[PDB]
Amino acid sequence: QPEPDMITIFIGTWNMGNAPPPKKITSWFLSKGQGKTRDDSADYIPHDIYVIGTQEDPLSEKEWLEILKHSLQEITSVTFKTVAIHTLWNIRIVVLAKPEHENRISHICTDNVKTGIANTLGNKGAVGVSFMFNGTSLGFVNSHLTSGSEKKLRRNQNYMNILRFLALGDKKLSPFNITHRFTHLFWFGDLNYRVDLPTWEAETIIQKIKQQQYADLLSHDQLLTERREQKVFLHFEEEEITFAPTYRFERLTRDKYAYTKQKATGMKYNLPSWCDRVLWKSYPLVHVVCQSYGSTSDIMTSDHSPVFATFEAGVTSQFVSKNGPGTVDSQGQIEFLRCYATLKTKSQTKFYLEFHSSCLESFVKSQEGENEEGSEGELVVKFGETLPKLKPIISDPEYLLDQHILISIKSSDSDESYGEGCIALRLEATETQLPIYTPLTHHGELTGHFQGEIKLQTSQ
Ligand SMILES: COc1ccc(NC(=O)Nc2cccs2)cn1
Numbered sequence: 409q410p411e412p413d414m415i416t417i418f419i420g421t422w423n424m425g426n427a428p429p430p431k432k433i434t435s436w437f438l439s440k441g442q443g444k445t446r447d448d449s450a451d452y453i454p455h456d457i458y459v460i461g462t463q464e465d466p467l468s469e470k471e472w473l474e475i476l477k478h479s480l481q482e483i484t485s486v487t488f489k490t491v492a493i494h495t496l497w498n499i500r501i502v503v504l505a506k507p508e509h510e511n512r513i514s515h516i517c518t519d520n521v522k523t524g525i526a527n528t529l530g531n532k533g534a535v536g537v538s539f540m541f542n543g544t545s546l547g548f549v550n551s552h553l554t555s556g557s558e559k560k561l562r563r564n565q566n567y568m569n570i571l572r573f574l575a576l577g578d579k580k581l582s583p584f585n586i587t588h589r590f591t592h593l594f595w596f597g598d599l600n601y602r603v604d605l606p607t608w609e610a611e612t613i614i615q616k617i618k619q620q621q622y623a624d625l626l627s628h629d630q631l632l633t634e635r636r637e638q639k640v641f642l643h644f645e646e647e648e649i650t651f652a653p654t655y656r657f658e659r660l661t662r663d664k665y666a667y668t669k670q671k672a673t674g675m676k677y678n679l680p681s682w683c684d685r686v687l688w689k690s691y692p693l694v695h696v697v698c699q700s701y702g703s704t705s706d707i708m709t710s711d712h713s714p715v716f717a718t719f720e721a722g723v724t725s726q727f728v729s730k731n732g733p734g735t736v737d738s739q740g741q742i743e744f745l746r747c748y749a750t751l752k753t754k755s756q757t758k759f760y761l762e763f764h765s766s767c768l769e770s771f772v773k774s775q776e777g778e779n780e781e782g783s784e785g786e787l788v789v790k791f792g793e794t795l796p797k798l799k800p801i802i803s804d805p806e807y808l809l810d811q812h813i814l815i816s817i818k819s820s821d822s823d824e825s826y827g828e829g830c831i832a833l834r835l836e837a838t839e840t841q842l843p844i845y846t847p848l849t850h851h852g853e854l855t856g857h858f859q860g861e862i863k864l865q866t867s868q
Pocket of ligand 1 (some may be wrong): 632633636637642643644645715
């Protein structure tokens with residue numbers, strides 16, 4: 409039975425509004441309702457992995473798992489296996505997978521982050537799950553960020569705390585946060601970004617929604633605008649939104665947005681907003697295609713509608729050769745030529761590189777680079793032709809061209825990373841000098857760039 413080169417992944421996010429769900433929620437898992445929806449002809453075809461994020465979830469783990477499993481069984485006639493479940497307060501993540509994947513899934517990690525301090529610590533934060541699916545690392549984050557139209561900066565701070573402190577994936581990748589640890593990272597939740605229009609425009613916004621005219625609303629969505637200004641979710645993707653705002657509804661119908669200030673809202677307006685989102689970040693040149701992104705119309709127990717997104721995602725096999733794993737394959741090598749880092753830092757320490765990859769036995773430290781002053785005030789760290797030759801464990805091009813090299817640039821003085829990036833080995837040619845490039849980030853913010861040339865030797 410051959411190993412897959414693709415899987416499909418369902419991502420769900422639902423703020424349940426502290427209310428139990430209705431008896432039928434199959435529309436969510438079928439990607440039916442508004443937006444980019446799934447074809448009826450696929451309804452019986454199970455996804456490989458279902459990842460369910462809830463917020464304001466009033467159920468026990470047992471109660472929600474029973475509902476999820478019985479839902480998927482009704483749809484697919486498959487009894488899904490529980491990969492992981494993790495809850496922080498009323499924020500929950502469930503990962504289910506087809507039984508045939510049980511022996512493909514390993515290295516399961518869970519963690520949470522609590523955001524805020526004192527007043528603002530006690531209900532917001534994130535839960536996450538990571539695991540290996542054969543040769544491919546998968547990370548999943550469900551976050552409930554700070555609420556309120558006037559708190560977009562707080563949400564951006566919540567995001568940075570979550571990506572710094574959520575401990576998922578391979579702990580040997582010590583310079584790297586979750587935005588570099590995974591082949592595919594999915595980040596979803598009640599991100600709580602609002603449509604930033606005046607309160608007086610509430611009825612005009614409602615009109616626009618009834619006409620399915622979302623363009624003038626999305627142009628004011630705080631998540632889109634903050635992402636355009638590189639304030640949050642740098643280097644993440646989001647499918648185009650073609651569904652109505654998923655908040656704030658009167659419960660038990662979808663006919664009414666409940667936006668007016670009430671004692672129950674702390675006298676805050678809740679203009680219709682796309683609070684409930686799914687974003688992703690995959691390593692360069694790995695296949696990932698969003699095949700649905702939408703909201704249900706028929707689940708009305710909460711003041712939020714459920715959101716679904718589905719993806720085709722490239723996966724690789726757990727490669728064995730006569731040589732690697734447990735030795736090198738002299739026939740393979742990775743060379744870096746004419747490489748330099750450009751850093752936004754004011755620091756004048758010397759820097760070195762670390763090269764991390766599951767195609768290496770262990771990470772590789774470079775010699776210190778040569779600092780020069782760049783014209784426009786920046787630091788340029790030149791490595792020229794000094795970088796070590798990397799010795800992959802397997803030289804077969806079917807393996808090596810699918811791999812990635814994580815790069816950290818570190819201070820000689822403090823051994824702290826000033827920037828992290830990723831280079832694909834999915835090259836146009838082997839035994840040929842080719843340009844490479846990655847932006848460098850630290851704590852998920854832009855700190856520089858790394859560019860140069862690569863020369864990859866495979867067994868072919
Ligand atoms: C390689 O990482 C990425 C990922 C996405 C992108 N493009 C964007 O982020 N485009 C956006 C327009 C407005 C908000 S965001 C570039 N590089």
